[PDB]
Amino acid sequence: PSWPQILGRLTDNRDLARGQAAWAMDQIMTGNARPAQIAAFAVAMTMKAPTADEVGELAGVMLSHAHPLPADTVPDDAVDVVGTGNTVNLSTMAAIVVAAAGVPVVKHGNRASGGADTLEALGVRIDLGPDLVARSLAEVGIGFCFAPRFHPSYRHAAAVRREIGVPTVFNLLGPLTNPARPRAGLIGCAFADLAEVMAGVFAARRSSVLVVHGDDGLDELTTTTTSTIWRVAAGSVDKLTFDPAGFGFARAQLDQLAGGDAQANAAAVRAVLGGARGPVRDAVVLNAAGAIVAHAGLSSRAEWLPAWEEGLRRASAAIDTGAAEQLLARWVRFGRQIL
Amino acid sequence: PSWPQILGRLTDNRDLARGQAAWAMDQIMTGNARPAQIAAFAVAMTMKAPTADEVGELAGVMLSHAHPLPADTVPDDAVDVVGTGGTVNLSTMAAIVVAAAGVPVVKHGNRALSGGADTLEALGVRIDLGPDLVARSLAEVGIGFCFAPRFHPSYRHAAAVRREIGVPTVFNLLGPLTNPARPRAGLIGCAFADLAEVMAGVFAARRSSVLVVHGDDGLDELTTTTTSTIWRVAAGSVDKLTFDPAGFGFARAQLDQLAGGDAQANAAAVRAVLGGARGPVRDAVVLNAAGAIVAHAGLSSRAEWLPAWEEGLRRASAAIDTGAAEQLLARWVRFGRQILE
Ligand SMILES: COc1ccc(C(=O)CC(=O)C(F)(F)F)cc1
Ligand SMILES: COc1ccc(C(=O)CC(=O)C(F)(F)F)cc1
């Protein structure tokens, strides 16, 4: 195995042999890959079109280098709510709403607005060690794994990612390398082909996940139009077309849903959790419900439609009853009380 | 203009906007491109499939950073004989034969398996010479060699990345398109049919008289193992042709018979061929030398394809069998040894 061999195979538009993606990622994680080699691999893998097996090797090697949460501190029904990339506004709000509905949530991200930035603008302490993320989950029902603290060996790839800027297969790794390893979640992707790849990876993990792609390009469930959902459970995938109009959701415009910077997002979080109505609320409710449906897929034998009706009810209620606003405040309170 | 913009465009399999490739290359040449950005660009451009316009921008910017040869020192009808990589043994021998046939030759390359420059050094040729001495070599010997690191010092950042990733990229095309002497004709081989057509487009834009050649066995030269595709470039237009050496009496050969080796072995092969040794290596050398001579003729006329080749094959054969090729290499070595005094 070597870079000329692996890079050559990719530029020739061939899928890699089993273990080659893993070899490449291990070189990258151990500081043995030159920045040029990392970049070449990232780009070549992207333009070749990665397979689920390849991405599975990349994520798997990365996790083998990550710091875990302490034993028996992550509830086995914890969920993730995130997109691959911007809808940080939607995913941040959805995550808070899901937690306020009684579902444990553990997120994973970094400062870019990134997921971490919006949370910091709300007064949340994002940079916590494993022991305290665990406490946060137990005491608040939500936690955040700061990527630099849990994936320190990813620093070389991270530097290259910043330098080239363009999205690559590495953008898919965030959701697939949550160090808390939640077994469920709502995972958005901006590209349909890659969404399907991600669903394949989650399937092999026996997770209960909704991998979602707005047919308008959104890396969340959209209200602008239909969405494609890759419904993942019991080692298999159920691909379907999803229309929120069937749940009474008005059609919105794309410019209404797009996130902004950390402060603009924070302002939007405060307004929505305060009860402000509009397209942004609807999108948050929609994706929160999606996460709740995924959560139900773990234990409940509840069917698709009734699961959604209950998920939408619980999401809306988490906002309307002030539970979400109250949970965020409790989350901020927790970080301040650590000192 | 930015890397995310340019790299984003390529990963979406779109051709670049005008000037974007030029911007990228200028960043690379001035040392302002990070290795990761250079690598990303090279790979992305390769997998998208580069256009003639894009490569023309790369080559043009690279040339603007290069040291030129002195004014009025390069003969108007100088030719190049080179491959973009798989046959260094063949292009080197063909170059000497072409020079011996009276066609000025100016090559361009680097030390590498013996590279083009390495083989010549093994024969006693001084390869690392400034522009004034390359000019003198062309005048006094009829052949010259531009040492790439000497003429393209600002390319060091790109070359370091090329070695690191190892895989062939669009940058492998730049050698023949950035010859500092800027010969207007030549025999240019490429191991990839699609990239060969791109190069032909660039030479056409320059209104060069060139044969871009591709062995249908993956050879970056005219092969004797099988047929070859040839893009006849002349008068700003391109004619794509199939080429069978058998139509000129050449017997089919095996690929392993044209096998290069270390610099000492290639040198031995050069001495053998120039000494008149018959065989498939000679045949391949004569065939590629003739190709360059046909391209040279295209500068001053549009002679018929078949008789051009027959005269070219004849001239190349004569250059060897008169001893002219062997004598020219000796004059080349002699010239190099004279520089010290
Ligand atoms: C300096 O060390 C680091 C710098 C940046 C990062 C990330 O940025 C990773 C990230 O988002 C992930 F995809 F979630 F993993 C990790 C380590
Ligand atoms: C140390 O600085 C350098 C190192 C290597 C080279 C090349 O090797 C370029 C080359 O082949 C060309 F495309 F023909 F120009 C140039 C400068």
XYZ file of C-alpha atoms and ligand atoms in Angstrom:
714
model
C 0.000 0.000 0.000
C 1.218 3.476 -0.961
C -0.046 6.921 -1.952
C 0.862 6.538 -5.630
C -1.022 3.225 -5.695
C -4.116 4.528 -3.885
C -4.173 7.981 -5.513
C -3.559 6.387 -8.904
C -6.504 4.050 -8.443
C -8.799 6.954 -7.469
C -7.740 9.265 -10.321
C -8.443 6.279 -12.570
C -12.012 6.441 -11.195
C -11.806 3.013 -9.562
C -13.149 1.983 -6.179
C -10.381 1.141 -3.723
C -9.524 -2.366 -2.582
C -10.701 -3.352 0.899
C -8.424 -1.813 3.535
C -6.867 0.865 1.299
C -9.095 3.697 2.545
C -8.303 2.490 6.074
C -4.564 2.568 5.344
C -4.810 6.100 3.950
C -6.820 7.345 6.922
C -4.436 5.771 9.444
C -1.491 7.498 7.747
C -3.409 10.761 8.008
C -4.344 10.219 11.665
C -0.794 9.336 12.775
C 0.836 12.417 11.253
C 2.596 10.363 8.566
C 0.749 11.864 5.591
C 2.111 14.985 3.921
C -0.449 17.800 3.531
C -0.222 17.325 -0.250
C -1.045 13.636 0.134
C -4.003 14.368 2.421
C -5.388 16.934 -0.021
C -4.879 14.697 -3.057
C -6.668 11.846 -1.300
C -9.551 14.015 -0.082
C -10.158 15.469 -3.552
C -9.623 12.248 -5.500
C -11.935 10.301 -3.196
C -14.570 13.008 -3.620
C -14.420 13.156 -7.419
C -14.263 9.372 -7.773
C -17.489 9.154 -5.699
C -16.874 7.380 -2.381
C -18.583 4.093 -1.504
C -20.168 3.211 1.836
C -17.410 0.657 2.433
C -14.716 3.289 1.860
C -16.391 5.906 4.067
C -16.916 3.187 6.672
C -13.170 2.574 6.734
C -12.406 6.306 7.001
C -14.827 6.875 9.876
C -13.815 3.633 11.576
C -10.105 4.441 11.640
C -10.859 7.970 12.833
C -12.966 6.678 15.730
C -10.188 4.259 16.711
C -8.052 7.350 17.391
C -10.724 9.341 19.225
C -11.226 9.742 22.962
C -14.370 7.977 24.207
C -16.909 9.099 26.786
C -16.541 7.254 30.111
C -18.041 3.758 30.342
C -21.814 3.642 30.832
C -22.385 7.411 30.682
C -24.049 7.664 27.271
C -27.656 6.426 27.329
C -28.048 3.740 24.669
C -30.922 5.767 23.190
C -28.999 9.033 22.767
C -29.502 10.771 19.417
C -27.540 13.130 17.192
C -29.010 16.015 15.196
C -26.759 17.513 12.530
C -26.103 18.186 8.845
C -22.933 17.734 6.791
C -23.100 21.287 5.433
C -25.438 26.019 6.145
C -28.208 24.924 8.522
C -26.424 25.097 11.886
C -29.310 27.304 13.003
C -31.850 24.545 12.323
C -29.807 21.666 13.756
C -28.849 23.582 16.905
C -32.474 24.517 17.580
C -33.762 21.053 16.680
C -31.258 19.445 19.069
C -32.436 21.623 21.964
C -36.079 20.891 21.146
C -35.433 17.138 20.963
C -33.722 17.169 24.366
C -36.602 19.179 25.834
C -38.945 16.435 24.599
C -37.119 13.971 26.865
C -34.727 12.430 24.331
C -31.014 12.401 25.244
C -28.972 14.367 22.699
C -25.226 14.363 22.200
C -23.813 16.599 19.494
C -20.381 16.850 17.936
C -18.699 19.797 16.240
C -16.100 22.550 16.175
C -15.725 26.318 15.798
C -15.787 27.230 12.097
C -20.796 29.711 11.896
C -20.134 26.159 13.049
C -22.297 24.205 15.475
C -20.046 25.156 18.371
C -20.093 28.886 17.561
C -23.862 29.323 17.796
C -23.899 27.449 21.114
C -21.122 29.650 22.513
C -23.096 32.737 21.461
C -25.946 31.385 23.602
C -23.592 31.079 26.577
C -23.041 27.319 26.434
C -19.603 26.040 27.471
C -18.614 23.884 24.497
C -15.071 22.794 25.391
C -15.606 20.139 28.079
C -13.794 16.891 28.844
C -15.390 13.418 28.626
C -16.278 13.326 32.331
C -18.191 16.613 32.151
C -19.934 15.935 28.841
C -21.145 12.814 30.636
C -22.381 14.894 33.575
C -24.053 17.341 31.186
C -25.960 14.462 29.576
C -27.058 13.055 32.930
C -28.037 16.390 34.477
C -29.303 18.395 31.489
C -30.133 15.669 28.965
C -27.839 17.207 26.367
C -24.108 17.320 25.699
C -21.593 18.586 23.161
C -18.350 16.862 22.166
C -15.789 19.471 21.116
C -14.049 17.864 18.139
C -10.523 19.155 18.829
C -10.707 17.649 22.328
C -11.995 14.233 21.217
C -10.261 13.964 17.816
C -6.831 15.493 18.502
C -5.143 13.262 15.915
C -7.430 14.734 13.237
C -5.528 18.038 13.390
C -3.505 17.376 10.224
C -6.611 16.643 8.142
C -8.378 19.620 9.732
C -5.566 21.959 8.677
C -5.709 20.690 5.086
C -9.500 20.973 5.034
C -9.201 24.653 5.955
C -6.474 25.351 3.385
C -8.392 23.972 0.393
C -11.796 25.068 1.665
C -13.757 23.034 -0.883
C -16.151 20.415 0.550
C -14.869 16.821 0.378
C -15.666 13.310 1.594
C -14.169 14.428 4.916
C -17.241 16.623 5.452
C -19.223 13.381 5.806
C -17.118 12.230 8.756
C -18.507 14.575 11.414
C -21.817 12.685 11.839
C -20.085 9.316 11.425
C -17.477 9.960 14.125
C -19.507 11.343 17.010
C -17.282 10.185 19.897
C -20.317 9.428 22.077
C -21.410 6.988 19.346
C -25.159 7.643 19.569
C -27.121 4.805 17.940
C -29.785 7.110 16.522
C -30.276 10.509 14.947
C -31.375 12.857 12.211
C -28.471 13.300 9.780
C -28.749 15.793 6.946
C -26.703 15.842 3.737
C -26.600 18.441 0.951
C -25.931 15.840 -1.767
C -28.283 12.938 -2.482
C -25.623 10.518 -3.720
C -23.526 11.009 -0.577
C -26.607 10.821 1.655
C -27.209 7.311 0.349
C -23.572 6.430 1.032
C -23.881 7.688 4.617
C -27.050 5.642 5.092
C -25.097 2.559 4.046
C -22.521 3.208 6.752
C -25.143 3.739 9.482
C -26.899 0.570 8.337
C -23.815 -1.556 9.019
C -23.788 -0.127 12.553
C -27.371 -1.247 13.200
C -28.247 2.344 14.081
C -31.722 3.854 13.878
C -31.168 6.922 11.728
C -33.013 9.169 9.323
C -30.523 10.335 6.718
C -32.246 13.261 5.036
C -31.764 15.404 1.957
C -34.003 18.291 0.972
C -34.829 17.994 -2.719
C -33.920 21.693 -2.808
C -30.359 20.824 -1.732
C -30.881 21.408 1.996
C -28.882 19.266 4.442
C -32.010 18.996 6.587
C -35.620 18.084 5.996
C -36.926 21.085 4.054
C -40.257 22.908 3.978
C -39.556 24.369 0.520
C -40.425 21.119 -1.223
C -40.181 17.348 -0.813
C -37.228 15.565 0.774
C -35.584 12.209 0.254
C -35.212 10.159 3.421
C -32.953 7.162 3.808
C -34.633 5.393 6.695
C -32.050 3.199 8.434
C -32.851 0.413 10.886
C -32.015 -3.230 11.605
C -29.132 -3.261 9.137
C -31.185 -2.137 6.139
C -32.275 1.014 4.318
C -35.742 2.177 3.268
C -35.501 5.019 0.741
C -38.609 7.168 0.372
C -39.962 10.508 -0.798
C -41.189 12.690 2.064
C -43.630 15.614 1.841
C -44.300 17.762 4.935
C -47.375 19.228 3.234
C -49.038 15.995 4.320
C -48.595 17.155 7.915
C -50.040 20.594 7.155
C -46.742 22.427 6.694
C -46.995 25.480 4.459
C -44.469 25.711 1.630
C -41.656 28.163 2.423
C -38.850 29.793 0.424
C -35.213 28.728 0.697
C -33.816 32.130 1.717
C -36.073 32.010 4.782
C -34.429 28.879 6.228
C -30.735 29.603 5.659
C -28.575 30.151 8.730
C -26.313 33.129 9.386
C -23.373 33.900 11.675
C -23.147 32.900 15.346
C -24.973 35.977 16.665
C -27.643 35.953 13.957
C -28.222 32.278 14.754
C -28.286 32.910 18.501
C -30.883 35.645 17.988
C -32.956 33.204 15.933
C -32.653 30.517 18.614
C -33.924 32.927 21.276
C -36.870 34.005 19.129
C -37.954 30.507 18.101
C -37.643 29.034 21.597
C -39.558 32.100 22.777
C -42.495 31.039 20.605
C -41.906 33.082 17.444
C -43.810 31.531 14.541
C -42.723 31.285 10.919
C -40.806 29.127 8.417
C -37.781 28.719 10.720
C -39.911 27.311 13.540
C -41.598 24.927 11.108
C -38.232 23.635 9.891
C -36.959 23.171 13.444
C -40.140 21.343 14.437
C -39.918 19.169 11.330
C -36.336 18.014 11.912
C -36.791 17.687 15.680
C -39.714 15.354 14.981
C -37.486 13.483 12.530
C -34.920 12.905 15.260
C -37.697 11.745 17.597
C -38.900 9.280 14.946
C -35.349 7.921 14.638
C -35.184 7.605 18.426
C -38.426 5.607 18.418
C -36.904 3.250 15.853
C -34.529 1.944 18.512
C -37.063 0.305 20.834
C -40.632 1.191 19.838
C -42.464 -0.922 17.277
C -44.378 2.244 16.375
C -45.074 2.599 12.662
C -43.903 5.415 10.379
C -46.953 7.703 10.232
C -48.040 7.467 13.873
C -44.384 7.891 14.889
C -44.284 11.147 12.907
C -47.559 12.465 14.339
C -46.277 11.854 17.859
C -42.888 13.348 16.992
C -44.441 16.534 15.638
C -46.671 16.797 18.706
C -43.744 16.362 21.093
C -41.555 18.816 19.196
C -44.220 21.525 19.023
C -45.042 20.962 22.687
C -41.383 21.205 23.715
C -41.375 24.718 22.244
C -44.878 25.859 23.209
C -44.605 24.720 26.843
C -41.324 26.591 27.262
C -39.514 23.303 27.881
C -36.928 24.038 25.182
C -36.288 27.588 26.396
C -36.009 26.222 29.927
C -33.603 23.457 28.901
C -31.244 25.871 27.131
C -31.183 28.054 30.242
C -30.489 24.962 32.337
C -27.708 24.064 29.894
C -26.093 27.501 30.201
C -26.536 27.291 33.975
C -24.710 23.951 34.018
C -21.616 25.351 32.292
C -21.392 28.331 34.631
C -21.820 26.102 37.691
C -18.834 23.946 36.691
C -16.447 26.590 38.037
C -10.732 34.443 -7.387
C -9.980 31.895 -4.657
C -9.108 28.261 -4.041
C -12.570 27.309 -2.722
C -14.136 28.875 -5.823
C -11.744 27.235 -8.285
C -11.510 23.867 -6.530
C -15.269 23.845 -5.997
C -15.798 24.312 -9.712
C -13.461 21.429 -10.600
C -14.959 18.983 -8.077
C -18.354 19.778 -9.615
C -16.832 18.589 -12.921
C -17.096 22.031 -14.531
C -14.545 23.749 -16.753
C -12.950 26.791 -15.117
C -13.880 30.370 -15.971
C -11.348 32.217 -18.123
C -8.312 33.309 -16.120
C -8.944 31.014 -13.148
C -6.281 28.473 -14.157
C -3.899 31.389 -14.732
C -4.598 32.757 -11.241
C -3.996 29.339 -9.698
C -0.707 28.921 -11.546
C 0.480 32.393 -10.572
C -0.162 31.535 -6.911
C 1.790 28.294 -7.378
C 4.726 30.003 -9.095
C 5.040 32.884 -6.591
C 5.175 30.532 -3.602
C 1.816 31.707 -2.244
C 0.056 28.374 -2.793
C 0.132 25.911 0.093
C 1.213 22.366 -0.840
C -2.326 21.177 -0.045
C -3.740 23.750 -2.460
C -1.268 22.750 -5.189
C -2.097 19.059 -4.765
C -5.850 19.684 -4.668
C -5.656 21.758 -7.844
C -3.486 19.279 -9.746
C -5.685 16.299 -8.868
C -8.991 18.139 -9.347
C -7.927 19.454 -12.767
C -6.806 15.977 -13.800
C -10.033 14.190 -12.857
C -12.289 16.878 -14.342
C -10.290 16.516 -17.607
C -8.396 19.716 -18.466
C -9.169 21.829 -21.543
C -6.652 23.254 -24.007
C -7.545 26.752 -22.804
C -6.921 25.781 -19.183
C -3.570 24.146 -19.945
C -2.633 27.096 -22.152
C -3.164 29.340 -19.148
C -1.021 27.115 -16.928
C 1.805 26.944 -19.468
C 1.676 30.647 -20.276
C 1.962 31.776 -16.665
C 4.775 29.272 -16.067
C 6.685 30.662 -19.056
C 6.279 34.220 -17.773
C 8.261 33.172 -14.681
C 10.929 31.298 -16.664
C 14.345 32.521 -17.756
C 14.469 32.933 -21.552
C 17.259 32.083 -23.973
C 19.093 35.132 -25.346
C 17.491 37.072 -28.215
C 17.964 35.673 -31.728
C 19.862 32.623 -30.456
C 17.216 29.966 -31.046
C 16.940 29.002 -34.727
C 13.524 29.759 -36.220
C 13.085 26.095 -37.157
C 14.232 24.463 -33.893
C 12.384 21.310 -32.798
C 11.675 19.453 -29.575
C 11.589 15.660 -29.182
C 10.042 14.587 -25.890
C 7.494 12.381 -24.145
C 5.366 13.360 -21.144
C 6.202 10.049 -19.438
C 4.992 6.467 -19.775
C 10.838 6.051 -23.226
C 13.572 8.510 -22.240
C 15.988 6.266 -24.120
C 14.057 6.730 -27.359
C 13.472 10.491 -27.231
C 17.124 11.054 -26.330
C 18.394 8.966 -29.240
C 15.850 10.438 -31.666
C 16.866 13.948 -30.634
C 20.505 13.219 -31.462
C 19.531 11.623 -34.791
C 17.307 14.600 -35.705
C 20.105 17.043 -34.855
C 22.447 14.918 -36.973
C 20.003 15.178 -39.884
C 20.498 18.957 -39.828
C 17.414 19.920 -37.807
C 18.217 22.097 -34.772
C 17.022 20.415 -31.565
C 16.486 21.999 -28.165
C 15.235 19.746 -25.411
C 13.992 20.506 -21.921
C 14.010 18.217 -18.891
C 15.317 17.190 -15.480
C 17.092 14.438 -13.560
C 14.733 11.594 -12.642
C 15.368 4.582 -13.772
C 17.454 7.045 -15.791
C 15.665 10.231 -16.833
C 16.411 12.202 -19.987
C 19.029 14.372 -18.339
C 20.565 11.410 -16.473
C 21.212 9.424 -19.649
C 22.925 12.396 -21.289
C 25.111 12.962 -18.227
C 26.105 9.294 -18.295
C 27.340 9.910 -21.855
C 29.448 12.848 -20.678
C 27.109 15.652 -21.733
C 26.985 18.773 -19.540
C 23.265 19.339 -18.963
C 23.214 22.155 -16.382
C 24.073 25.219 -18.464
C 22.906 28.813 -18.430
C 20.990 30.339 -21.367
C 24.117 31.760 -23.035
C 25.782 28.344 -23.261
C 22.638 26.533 -24.412
C 22.505 29.137 -27.170
C 26.150 28.485 -28.024
C 25.561 24.719 -28.002
C 22.716 25.130 -30.497
C 24.915 27.279 -32.727
C 28.084 25.183 -32.560
C 26.655 21.664 -32.138
C 23.089 21.916 -33.481
C 21.572 20.643 -30.249
C 20.918 22.088 -26.811
C 19.401 21.094 -23.479
C 17.515 23.353 -21.054
C 17.904 22.078 -17.495
C 14.455 22.643 -16.027
C 15.458 23.617 -12.473
C 17.770 26.235 -13.993
C 15.112 27.801 -16.235
C 12.028 27.189 -14.054
C 13.285 27.858 -10.493
C 9.877 29.165 -9.377
C 8.370 25.761 -10.231
C 10.108 24.202 -7.204
C 6.951 24.290 -5.074
C 4.898 22.436 -7.681
C 7.652 19.883 -8.330
C 7.904 19.079 -4.619
C 4.155 18.354 -4.554
C 4.385 16.259 -7.731
C 6.957 13.984 -6.077
C 4.942 13.765 -2.859
C 1.717 12.540 -4.488
C 3.505 10.488 -7.150
C 0.443 10.012 -9.348
C 0.490 11.583 -12.836
C -1.440 14.861 -13.163
C -2.131 17.634 -15.664
C 1.228 19.082 -14.595
C 2.944 16.217 -16.442
C 1.866 17.997 -19.644
C 3.732 21.216 -18.870
C 7.247 20.067 -19.786
C 6.683 20.075 -23.576
C 4.556 23.232 -23.322
C 7.104 25.263 -21.349
C 10.338 24.579 -23.215
C 12.222 27.838 -22.473
C 13.617 27.936 -26.016
C 10.050 27.865 -27.345
C 10.674 25.703 -30.420
C 7.814 26.016 -32.911
C 7.947 22.388 -34.024
C 8.486 18.962 -32.543
C 7.554 15.366 -31.907
C 5.581 15.296 -28.639
C 4.513 11.980 -27.143
C 1.858 11.380 -24.494
C 0.848 8.202 -22.658
C -2.834 9.240 -22.579
C -4.959 9.693 -25.701
C -7.294 12.301 -24.203
C -4.502 14.477 -22.807
C -2.643 14.111 -26.109
C -5.583 15.757 -27.871
C -5.550 18.566 -25.300
C -1.840 19.213 -25.903
C -2.490 19.244 -29.644
C -5.052 21.973 -29.046
C -2.509 24.066 -27.169
C 0.134 23.668 -29.887
C -2.529 24.573 -32.443
C -3.306 27.797 -30.572
C 0.411 28.602 -30.751
C 0.332 27.757 -34.461
C 3.146 25.253 -33.955
C 3.999 22.515 -36.453
C 3.872 19.473 -34.196
C 3.120 15.777 -34.266
C 1.506 14.825 -30.977
C 1.832 11.049 -30.798
C 0.339 8.278 -28.688
C 1.282 4.610 -28.824
C -1.815 2.416 -28.764
C 0.046 0.331 -26.181
C 0.332 3.292 -23.796
C 3.694 4.436 -25.137
C 4.504 8.155 -25.061
C 6.313 7.745 -28.396
C 5.589 6.382 -31.846
C 5.657 2.653 -31.151
C 6.757 -0.327 -33.228
C 4.793 -2.705 -30.985
C 1.527 -1.698 -32.645
C -0.296 1.219 -34.270
C -0.281 4.801 -32.978
C -2.618 7.785 -32.915
C -1.160 11.008 -34.312
C -2.525 14.524 -34.035
C -0.957 16.395 -36.947
C -0.862 20.017 -35.801
C -0.274 22.681 -38.450
C -1.712 26.056 -39.507
C -3.677 26.404 -36.274
C -5.700 23.286 -37.119
C -5.513 19.602 -36.161
C -5.812 16.399 -38.203
C -6.184 13.199 -36.169
C -4.603 10.161 -37.842
C -3.986 6.462 -37.251
C -0.404 5.361 -37.893
C 0.936 1.900 -38.707
C 4.739 1.531 -39.014
C 4.146 -1.736 -40.896
C 3.207 0.439 -43.866
C 6.875 1.467 -43.986
C 8.313 -2.040 -43.635
C 8.790 -1.998 -39.872
C 8.394 -5.382 -38.205
C 6.319 -5.685 -35.040
C 8.360 -5.690 -31.824
C 7.763 -6.571 -28.171
C 7.423 -3.857 -25.541
C 10.084 -5.362 -23.265
C 12.555 -4.965 -26.144
C 12.231 -1.182 -25.802
C 13.004 -1.435 -22.082
C 14.828 1.445 -20.420
C 17.120 0.902 -17.442
C 19.626 2.717 -15.249
C 21.642 5.592 -16.723
C 24.649 3.379 -17.501
C 22.496 0.933 -19.477
C 20.689 3.628 -21.455
C 24.086 5.110 -22.305
C 25.180 1.695 -23.578
C 22.038 1.478 -25.715
C 22.667 4.953 -27.147
C 26.233 4.027 -28.087
C 24.955 0.819 -29.691
C 22.252 2.445 -31.820
C 24.424 5.385 -32.886
C 27.082 2.787 -33.692
C 24.714 1.282 -36.258
C 23.319 -1.679 -34.313
C 20.131 -2.978 -35.938
C 16.989 -4.012 -34.071
C 13.662 -2.729 -32.694
C 15.312 0.034 -30.639
C 16.904 1.506 -33.773
C 13.581 1.154 -35.583
C 11.753 3.056 -32.843
C 14.434 5.757 -32.772
C 14.380 6.127 -36.562
C 10.575 6.242 -36.516
C 10.362 9.008 -33.894
C 13.251 10.931 -35.437
C 11.389 10.840 -38.750
C 8.281 12.097 -36.951
C 10.153 15.158 -35.707
C 11.599 15.760 -39.171
C 8.092 15.620 -40.662
C 6.963 18.181 -38.074
C 9.964 20.368 -38.928
C 8.991 20.265 -42.612
C 5.495 21.416 -41.684
C 6.939 24.796 -40.706
C 7.800 25.740 -44.291
C 5.352 23.608 -46.282
C 2.361 21.263 -46.304
C 3.964 18.349 -48.141
C 2.110 15.068 -48.606
C 1.963 12.870 -45.501
C 3.457 9.691 -46.967
C 6.377 11.141 -48.946
C 7.252 13.403 -46.010
C 7.631 10.311 -43.853
C 9.661 8.410 -46.431
C 12.112 11.298 -46.753
C 12.133 11.632 -42.970
C 12.773 7.931 -42.407
C 15.528 8.136 -45.015
C 17.188 11.166 -43.422
C 17.048 9.592 -39.960
C 18.543 6.340 -41.257
C 21.276 8.195 -43.129
C 22.057 10.293 -40.044
C 22.898 7.076 -38.203
C 24.571 5.093 -41.000
C 26.833 7.929 -42.166
C 28.148 8.135 -38.603
C 26.708 11.651 -38.325
C 24.617 10.899 -35.230
C 27.538 9.272 -33.412
C 29.795 12.161 -34.445
C 27.252 14.742 -33.260
C 27.107 13.251 -29.763
C 30.906 13.423 -29.672
C 30.810 17.080 -30.723
C 28.224 17.648 -27.998
C 30.465 16.115 -25.342
C 33.460 18.025 -26.715
C 31.550 21.318 -26.481
C 30.728 20.632 -22.844
C 34.354 19.888 -21.950
C 35.435 23.148 -23.624
C 33.384 25.222 -21.167
C 35.917 24.858 -18.331
C 38.713 26.531 -20.316
C -6.297 20.900 16.149
O -6.991 19.642 16.179
C -8.242 19.601 15.530
C -8.723 20.691 14.779
C -9.992 20.612 14.140
C -10.781 19.436 14.261
C -12.137 19.351 13.569
O -12.627 20.367 13.115
C -12.823 18.041 13.436
C -14.322 18.085 13.104
O -14.943 19.136 12.952
C -15.041 16.763 12.967
F -15.286 16.514 11.712
F -16.167 16.796 13.653
F -14.247 15.776 13.467
C -10.280 18.344 15.018
C -9.024 18.430 15.644
C 14.190 22.921 -7.704
O 13.306 23.566 -8.636
C 12.766 22.749 -9.647
C 12.680 21.346 -9.490
C 12.136 20.546 -10.513
C 11.662 21.140 -11.713
C 11.069 20.269 -12.813
O 11.311 19.076 -12.813
C 10.185 20.881 -13.836
C 9.950 20.075 -15.125
O 10.206 18.873 -15.200
C 9.363 20.798 -16.320
F 8.053 20.646 -16.334
F 9.889 20.300 -17.477
F 9.626 22.070 -16.236
C 11.745 22.547 -11.865
C 12.296 23.345 -10.826
